[PDB]
Every structure is written in structure tokens, then in C-alpha cells.
Amino acid sequence: VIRGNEVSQIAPGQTGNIADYNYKLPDDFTGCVIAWNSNKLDSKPSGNY
Amino acid sequence: PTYGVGHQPYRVVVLSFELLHAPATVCGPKKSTNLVKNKCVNFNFNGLTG
Amino acid sequence: YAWNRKRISNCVADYSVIYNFAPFFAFKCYGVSPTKLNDLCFTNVYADSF
């Protein structure tokens, strides 16, 4: 999972702290990316711990 | 979600597809066809068409 | 019709922090890219807004 404010961090070859210390795609990737909003993940006004 | 426009996280289910060079072990819902030789026959040998 | 243009000079050019200074969704960049924007060094920047 990512922050979701930008989804263009999972792609073959760009740099950013979301996907420079966590996940890195090779330059010969032959796969697929699917992404969608998460709504019912958690529900409290003050936020989780 | 009290704040919005991208504030919610994105679920990412990236799949990695490896080209074969090996036994396949998953292909697709096509079943079989009886083998025949010495004739002009369309091919679907392990995915690539000919 | 009355968009303000402000002049910015003699400061640290940090573009990796405007990602979370504003709740937006990516860039419509032409000519440059936001990934290697902090590695550059140029004359002036103006931030028109409306």
C-alpha cells in the first residue's frame, strides 16, 4: 500500500522516497498495476494508533 | 477521509509475468485438441500462435 | 482575469516538499519532471494562481 496522494510511484524507473527505499521496478518489467481507493479500512475521527 | 482528494491510500496488487522458457503450470481456459502432423495446421503451442 | 505573479529568488529550491504541502494528484508537467526537479539550477520561478 502507498499514500495514495500520488499513484505514479510504481513504474519502471522513477525516484521518490515512497519507492526508493521500499519497492523498485526493473527496466524490463512485463506486468500490470491495479490501484483503487480504500474507504472502509478504518473508521474513527481521531485516527488510529 | 475527513480530508480528501487522494488522502485515502491506494491498494496495489502488481502482478509479475515471467516469459516461459520452462514448464508453464498456468496457461488459460482453452482445453485441448487432437494432435495431427503433416498438414497445414494453425498452432497454439504453449501460447504463441503460428 | 487578475492572476497574481510573484517573483521568487535567493532561496532553497525544494520541490520534494510541495508534494505534501498541497493535497493534489500528480503533475501535468511539460518540459521537466517532478522526480528530478530538485537536481536542477535555473534563474527564476513564478507561481501564477487562480
Side-chain angles (χ1 to χ4, degrees):
Chain A
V1 75
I2 48 168
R3 44 183 291 183
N5 204 231
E6 58 86 20
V7 71
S8 169
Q9 218 59 67
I10 298 92
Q14 72 270 23
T15 310
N17 53 27
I18 295 95
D20 207 53
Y21 319 128
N22 303 281
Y23 206 99
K24 188 63 74 199
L25 277 298
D27 287 7
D28 53 341
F29 191 39
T30 306
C32 287
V33 189
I34 48 176
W36 60 98
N37 261 325
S38 181
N39 192 26
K40 303 301 179 68
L41 181 61
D42 269 323
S43 194
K44 58 185 78 172
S46 66
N48 289 62
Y49 306 134
Chain B
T2 48
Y3 274 73
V5 186
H7 275 100
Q8 301 164 241
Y10 270 44
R11 194 138 312 180
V12 173
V13 184
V14 160
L15 311 166
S16 307
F17 294 140
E18 183 178 1
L19 311 173
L20 291 167
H21 68 80
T25 300
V26 58
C27 199
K30 327 183 66 172
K31 56 177 74 67
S32 278
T33 300
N34 292 37
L35 189 46
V36 72
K37 313 168 205 301
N38 319 300
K39 271 169 202 67
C40 201
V41 179
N42 277 334
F43 293 101
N44 212 305
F45 284 166
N46 286 124
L48 73 164
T49 312
Chain C
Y1 79 109
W3 46 275
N4 50 0
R5 180 188 290 230
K6 66 182 291 294
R7 192 191 140 83
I8 297 89
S9 280
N10 315 303
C11 70
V12 169
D14 210 306
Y15 315 104
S16 299
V17 298
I18 78 174
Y19 272 130
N20 45 10
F21 280 131
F24 62 92
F25 205 101
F27 281 68
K28 279 93 180 172
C29 279
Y30 293 99
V32 296
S33 283
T35 62
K36 334 302 181 203
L37 204 61
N38 45 359
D39 291 331
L40 285 156
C41 191
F42 51 86
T43 305
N44 289 128
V45 64
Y46 305 106
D48 317 317
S49 190
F50 36 81

Coordinates of all heavy atoms in Angstrom, one line a residue, chain A residues 1-5 7 29-39 41, chain B residues 1-2 4-19:
Chain A
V1 N 0.9 -1.2 0.0 CA 0.0 0.0 0.0 C 0.9 1.2 0.0 O 2.1 1.2 0.4 CB -1.0 0.0 1.2 CG1 -0.3 0.3 2.5 CG2 -2.2 0.9 1.0
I2 N 0.4 2.3 -0.5 CA 1.1 3.6 -0.6 C 0.2 4.7 0.0 O -0.8 4.4 0.6 CB 1.4 3.9 -2.1 CG1 0.2 3.7 -3.0 CG2 2.6 3.1 -2.6 CD1 0.4 4.3 -4.4
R3 N 0.7 5.9 -0.1 CA 0.0 7.1 0.5 C -1.3 7.4 -0.3 O -2.3 7.7 0.3 CB 0.9 8.3 0.5 CG 1.7 8.5 -0.8 CD 2.6 9.8 -0.7 NE 1.8 11.0 -0.6 CZ 2.4 12.2 -0.6 NH1 3.7 12.4 -0.5 NH2 1.6 13.3 -0.5
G4 N -1.3 7.2 -1.6 CA -2.5 7.4 -2.4 C -2.6 8.8 -3.0 O -3.4 9.0 -3.9
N5 N -1.9 9.8 -2.4 CA -1.9 11.2 -2.9 C -1.3 11.2 -4.3 O -1.7 12.0 -5.2 CB -1.2 12.1 -2.0 CG -1.7 13.5 -2.2 OD1 -0.9 14.5 -2.3 ND2 -3.0 13.7 -2.1
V7 N -0.1 8.1 -7.2 CA 0.0 6.7 -7.5 C 1.1 6.4 -8.5 O 1.5 5.3 -8.6 CB -1.4 6.2 -8.0 CG1 -1.7 6.7 -9.4 CG2 -1.5 4.6 -7.9
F29 N 10.2 -4.6 -17.0 CA 9.0 -5.1 -16.4 C 8.0 -5.5 -17.4 O 7.8 -4.8 -18.4 CB 8.4 -4.0 -15.5 CG 7.3 -4.5 -14.6 CD1 7.4 -5.7 -14.0 CD2 6.2 -3.7 -14.3 CE1 6.4 -6.2 -13.2 CE2 5.2 -4.1 -13.5 CZ 5.3 -5.4 -12.9
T30 N 7.3 -6.6 -17.2 CA 6.3 -7.1 -18.1 C 5.1 -7.5 -17.3 O 4.6 -8.7 -17.4 CB 7.0 -8.3 -18.9 OG1 8.2 -7.8 -19.5 CG2 6.1 -8.7 -20.1
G31 N 4.6 -6.6 -16.5 CA 3.5 -6.9 -15.7 C 2.3 -5.9 -15.7 O 2.2 -5.2 -16.7
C32 N 1.5 -5.9 -14.7 CA 0.3 -5.0 -14.7 C 0.2 -4.4 -13.3 O 0.5 -5.0 -12.3 CB -1.0 -5.7 -15.0 SG -1.1 -6.1 -16.8
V33 N -0.3 -3.2 -13.2 CA -0.6 -2.4 -12.0 C -2.1 -2.1 -11.9 O -2.7 -1.6 -12.9 CB 0.2 -1.1 -11.9 CG1 0.1 -0.5 -10.6 CG2 1.7 -1.3 -12.3
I34 N -2.7 -2.4 -10.8 CA -4.1 -2.1 -10.5 C -4.1 -1.3 -9.2 O -3.4 -1.7 -8.2 CB -5.0 -3.3 -10.5 CG1 -4.4 -4.5 -9.6 CG2 -5.2 -3.8 -11.9 CD1 -5.3 -5.7 -9.5
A35 N -4.9 -0.3 -9.1 CA -5.0 0.6 -8.0 C -6.4 1.2 -7.8 O -7.0 1.5 -8.8 CB -4.0 1.8 -8.1
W36 N -6.8 1.3 -6.6 CA -8.2 1.9 -6.3 C -8.2 2.5 -4.9 O -7.3 2.2 -4.1 CB -9.3 0.8 -6.5 CG -9.1 -0.4 -5.5 CD1 -9.7 -0.6 -4.4 CD2 -8.3 -1.5 -5.8 NE1 -9.4 -1.8 -3.8 CE2 -8.5 -2.4 -4.7 CE3 -7.4 -1.9 -6.8 CZ2 -7.8 -3.6 -4.5 CZ3 -6.8 -3.1 -6.7 CH2 -7.0 -4.0 -5.6
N37 N -9.2 3.3 -4.7 CA -9.4 3.9 -3.4 C -9.8 2.9 -2.3 O -10.4 1.9 -2.5 CB -10.4 5.0 -3.4 CG -9.8 6.4 -3.6 OD1 -8.8 6.7 -3.0 ND2 -10.5 7.3 -4.4
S38 N -9.3 3.2 -1.1 CA -9.7 2.4 0.1 C -10.6 3.3 1.0 O -10.2 4.4 1.4 CB -8.5 2.0 0.9 OG -8.8 1.2 2.0
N39 N -11.8 2.8 1.3 CA -12.8 3.5 2.1 C -13.1 3.0 3.5 O -13.0 3.7 4.5 CB -14.1 3.6 1.3 CG -15.1 4.6 1.8 OD1 -14.7 5.6 2.5 ND2 -16.4 4.3 1.6
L41 N -11.4 1.0 5.4 CA -10.2 0.4 6.0 C -10.2 0.6 7.5 O -10.0 -0.3 8.3 CB -8.9 1.0 5.4 CG -7.6 0.5 5.9 CD1 -7.5 -1.0 5.7 CD2 -6.4 1.2 5.3
Chain B
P1 N -10.5 9.9 5.9 CA -11.4 10.6 5.0 C -12.1 11.9 5.4 O -12.9 12.4 4.6 CB -12.5 9.6 4.7 CG -12.0 8.3 5.2 CD -10.6 8.5 5.8
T2 N -11.8 12.5 6.6 CA -12.2 13.8 6.9 C -11.5 14.8 5.9 O -12.2 15.8 5.6 CB -11.8 14.2 8.3 OG1 -10.5 13.8 8.6 CG2 -12.7 13.5 9.3
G4 N -9.8 14.9 2.0 CA -9.9 14.0 0.8 C -9.0 14.4 -0.3 O -8.0 15.1 -0.1
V5 N -9.4 14.0 -1.6 CA -8.6 14.2 -2.8 C -7.3 13.5 -2.6 O -6.3 14.2 -2.4 CB -8.5 15.7 -3.3 CG1 -7.8 15.8 -4.6 CG2 -9.9 16.3 -3.3
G6 N -7.3 12.2 -2.7 CA -6.0 11.4 -2.6 C -5.5 11.1 -1.2 O -4.5 10.4 -1.1
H7 N -6.2 11.6 -0.2 CA -5.8 11.3 1.2 C -5.9 9.8 1.5 O -5.1 9.3 2.3 CB -6.6 12.2 2.2 CG -6.0 13.6 2.3 ND1 -6.5 14.7 1.7 CD2 -4.9 14.0 3.1 CE1 -5.8 15.7 2.1 NE2 -4.9 15.4 2.9
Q8 N -6.9 9.1 1.0 CA -7.0 7.7 1.2 C -5.9 6.9 0.5 O -5.5 7.3 -0.6 CB -8.4 7.2 0.8 CG -9.6 8.0 1.5 CD -10.9 7.7 0.8 OE1 -11.5 8.7 0.4 NE2 -11.3 6.5 0.7
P9 N -5.5 5.8 1.1 CA -4.4 5.0 0.5 C -4.9 4.2 -0.7 O -6.1 4.1 -0.9 CB -4.0 4.1 1.6 CG -4.5 4.7 2.9 CD -5.7 5.4 2.5
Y10 N -4.0 3.8 -1.5 CA -4.3 3.0 -2.7 C -3.8 1.6 -2.6 O -2.6 1.4 -2.3 CB -3.7 3.7 -4.0 CG -4.5 4.7 -4.7 CD1 -5.2 5.7 -3.9 CD2 -4.6 4.7 -6.1 CE1 -6.0 6.6 -4.6 CE2 -5.4 5.7 -6.7 CZ -6.1 6.6 -6.0 OH -6.9 7.5 -6.6
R11 N -4.7 0.6 -2.8 CA -4.3 -0.8 -2.8 C -3.6 -1.2 -4.1 O -4.2 -0.9 -5.2 CB -5.5 -1.7 -2.5 CG -5.1 -3.1 -2.1 CD -6.0 -3.6 -1.0 NE -6.1 -2.7 0.1 CZ -6.8 -2.8 1.2 NH1 -7.5 -3.9 1.4 NH2 -6.8 -1.9 2.2
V12 N -2.4 -1.8 -4.0 CA -1.6 -2.1 -5.2 C -1.3 -3.5 -5.3 O -0.7 -4.1 -4.4 CB -0.3 -1.2 -5.2 CG1 0.5 -1.6 -6.4 CG2 -0.6 0.3 -5.3
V13 N -1.8 -4.2 -6.4 CA -1.8 -5.7 -6.5 C -1.0 -5.9 -7.8 O -1.5 -6.5 -8.7 CB -3.2 -6.3 -6.5 CG1 -3.2 -7.8 -6.5 CG2 -3.9 -5.8 -5.2
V14 N 0.2 -5.3 -7.9 CA 1.1 -5.5 -9.0 C 1.4 -7.0 -9.2 O 1.8 -7.7 -8.3 CB 2.4 -4.7 -8.8 CG1 3.6 -5.3 -9.7 CG2 2.2 -3.3 -9.2
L15 N 1.1 -7.5 -10.4 CA 1.5 -8.9 -10.8 C 2.7 -8.9 -11.7 O 2.9 -7.9 -12.5 CB 0.3 -9.5 -11.6 CG -1.1 -9.3 -11.0 CD1 -2.2 -9.7 -12.1 CD2 -1.3 -10.3 -9.8
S16 N 3.5 -9.9 -11.5 CA 4.7 -10.1 -12.3 C 4.6 -11.3 -13.2 O 4.3 -12.4 -12.7 CB 6.0 -10.2 -11.4 OG 6.0 -9.2 -10.5
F17 N 4.7 -11.1 -14.5 CA 4.6 -12.1 -15.5 C 5.9 -12.4 -16.1 O 6.6 -11.6 -16.7 CB 3.6 -11.7 -16.7 CG 2.2 -11.5 -16.2 CD1 1.5 -10.4 -16.7 CD2 1.6 -12.3 -15.3 CE1 0.1 -10.2 -16.3 CE2 0.3 -12.1 -14.9 CZ -0.4 -11.1 -15.4
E18 N 6.4 -13.7 -15.9 CA 7.6 -14.1 -16.4 C 7.4 -14.9 -17.8 O 6.5 -15.7 -17.9 CB 8.3 -15.1 -15.4 CG 9.7 -15.5 -15.9 CD 10.4 -16.4 -14.8 OE1 9.7 -16.6 -13.8 OE2 11.5 -16.8 -15.0
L19 N 8.2 -14.5 -18.8 CA 8.1 -15.3 -20.0 C 8.6 -16.7 -19.8 O 9.4 -16.9 -18.9 CB 9.0 -14.5 -21.1 CG 8.7 -13.1 -21.2 CD1 9.7 -12.4 -22.2 CD2 7.2 -12.8 -21.7

